[PDB]
Design a protein around this ligand. Sequence first.
Ligand SMILES: CN(C)CCc1nnc2cc(-c3ccccc3)c3cc(Cl)ccc3n12
Ligand SMILES: CN(C)CCc1nnc2cc(-c3ccccc3)c3cc(Cl)ccc3n12
Lengths: 369, 368
Amino acid sequence: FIEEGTFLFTSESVGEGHPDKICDQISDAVLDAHLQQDPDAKVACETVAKTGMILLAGEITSRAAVDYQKVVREAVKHIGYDDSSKGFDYKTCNVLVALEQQSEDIGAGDQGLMFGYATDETEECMPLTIVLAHKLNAKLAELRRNGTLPWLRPDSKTQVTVQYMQDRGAVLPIRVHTIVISVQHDEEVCLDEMRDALKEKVIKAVVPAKYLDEDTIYHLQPSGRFVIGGPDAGLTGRKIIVDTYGGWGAHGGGAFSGKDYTKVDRSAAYAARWVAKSLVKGGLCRRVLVQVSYAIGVSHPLSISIFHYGTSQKSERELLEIVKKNFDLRPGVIVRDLDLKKPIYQRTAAYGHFGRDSFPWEVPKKLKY
Amino acid sequence: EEGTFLFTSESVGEGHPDKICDQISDAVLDAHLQQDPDAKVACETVAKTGMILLAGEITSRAAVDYQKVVREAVKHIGYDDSSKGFDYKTCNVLVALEQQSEEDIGAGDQGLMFGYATDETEECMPLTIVLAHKLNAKLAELRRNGTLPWLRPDSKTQVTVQYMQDRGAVLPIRVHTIVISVQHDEEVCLDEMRDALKEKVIKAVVPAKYLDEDTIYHLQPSGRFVIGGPDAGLTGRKIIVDTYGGWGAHGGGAFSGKDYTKVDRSAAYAARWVAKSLVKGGLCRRVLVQVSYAIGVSHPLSISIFHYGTSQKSERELLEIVKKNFDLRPGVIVRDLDLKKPIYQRTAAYGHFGRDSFPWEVPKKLKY
Ligand SMILES: CN(C)CCc1nnc2cc(-c3ccccc3)c3cc(Cl)ccc3n12
Ligand SMILES: CN(C)CCc1nnc2cc(-c3ccccc3)c3cc(Cl)ccc3n12
């Protein structure tokens, strides 16, 4: 009756050097550049990355004077692409700019639906699957940049499958079932050396030992040689599940990067996460989903909906009343509460927008009820 | 009403900049498959003010006129004059496509995909997303037959349904709120549009039993909507619209512009196939199926099933049934669902799921 009560679930993450994530980071690098000069800048910056080319497309209303060449190349440099042998060089890439730039009860800028989610299974109130997947990429980047593993290159993908049990609506991670790691590398290091390092210096430095056992399946560099990576074009907003909960909770479809606070796709999703995390940390539930919806002409949310998966003694109707007395989810109010005019967005564009307590929406609000 | 909840899904029309890109990408995919069934295609489209950009990689024996494909797609969508904000005759098309010239084959990538099905509609789909899609389809229908000649291709719809649930089964009670925004010419007045949207669109799509006098209508809520179409549109930026409207789950992979060798598409189609087969087979009322792959590996890394409590059989038992009836290796999925056919442009608007003309929407008869 053991394997009848357990289930597997998988989440993935990608490194800074993955073509899609390159675009997210560049898009938010542009957003930050504008906000540093003009806190009220309106930005919708889409980035396309392909073989020796970065294209910026979208609309900007800003007083800022932004050197897009410098912004893009410094972003690519920071990511780690500085030579043709790595498949991409910030010094020589073609940068094409196609941005049309112009100089509290406000209606939503669009329509749409957004979700926030939280779970007590980790201290950061995030699913273990997506937390581990992210941290594997962060470790890779760390070991690349300090020279511990100098053969590493920026592009990578990780995938973590966790064995779960459910406990009265709450989910409880038992063990890591399967781990996948594929990462770009130079032409010198051999497969064996890489696979040993990925297990001992990456996986074992990231995953708590209690989740690993002798049955855990490792797929390390499963395709083999991975010398040329980075920019099949990458596009901004093509990793939105990686950006959020790794498949847990729910998603309304809106991408985050390249968008300023007036885009409810971003601000309302941050706020919804804020609500969800505040509820769980507040001890009101162990696990919770929050949906918000807007109309392009209306300031107040069209609907606010709450699912606590049965992990609360309070009803969802009751939780909604608590949320309404503690939160104002109008776009113009979210900005003030979460201080969203700060140039803080490039840091969100890799390793997930949620689960890191340096972000305002990751600091639980003390609830009054 | 402690047991009721609201849930909202949205859809967009063919003229929405993101969906324009999805359609173009799949028009390109189809063009190759029509000449070369074994074509490898990864086509990304970018659409902005007077410009369509194609970027990606193609391995094909086909000789494809990308100019004709793109412009004919834009024409079909309905953008044929500058007064509409976009004209297939004059748009700038930039092509940056690099073109190059069994059952146990490894996955082309890694990733996770979900399939979902629910017995709340005949098409085994959530009511919210079915209605949202069908509202946009009705708009295009009435635009193209000339019933509402003031209509233009760009549109967005949003449907909020009031639900009840019984141990995981979801029971739609009524439509709570409907939002419709649609592009239009400079002549027709707002009142004429709003009354038409209610009487000729909404009442023609939504079952009367779901509508009452408390239903909230937001028709042309932003007002004047003359300029629509190409904020740039991008391929793969409407993946929740493409699937279940927020229900079930999503692994993050976009569909359009990708050939069948991309598990992001083929395995998501297969998972829907599995899920719909289970519900239509009477094994559950509602079900979520996750599958995951690793690059280079043929068999799924994991297959996982959540029936939300809507089956008397356990999920382990449902898994036993799935494994005995389905082979979820990438190379076998292609053969079972006939995925080398140029059928993909048809998927790129109004949702990939819930329409029975697609192979993954024909339930497999289960043996167990
Ligand atoms: C008794 N039985 C073993 C319990 C199994 C169980 N209990 N709670 C959940 C939640 C999800 C889930 C749903 C949506 C999104 C993410 C995860 C889930 C998903 C999958 Cl594929 C399989 C099982 C799942 N599950
Ligand atoms: C007794 N109480 C009224 C029950 C409420 C309820 N019962 N089943 C579901 C499922 C979802 C759901 C989850 C994930 C995706 C889609 C829908 C959901 C979502 C929201 Cl925002 C609110 C409530 C939801 N729900």
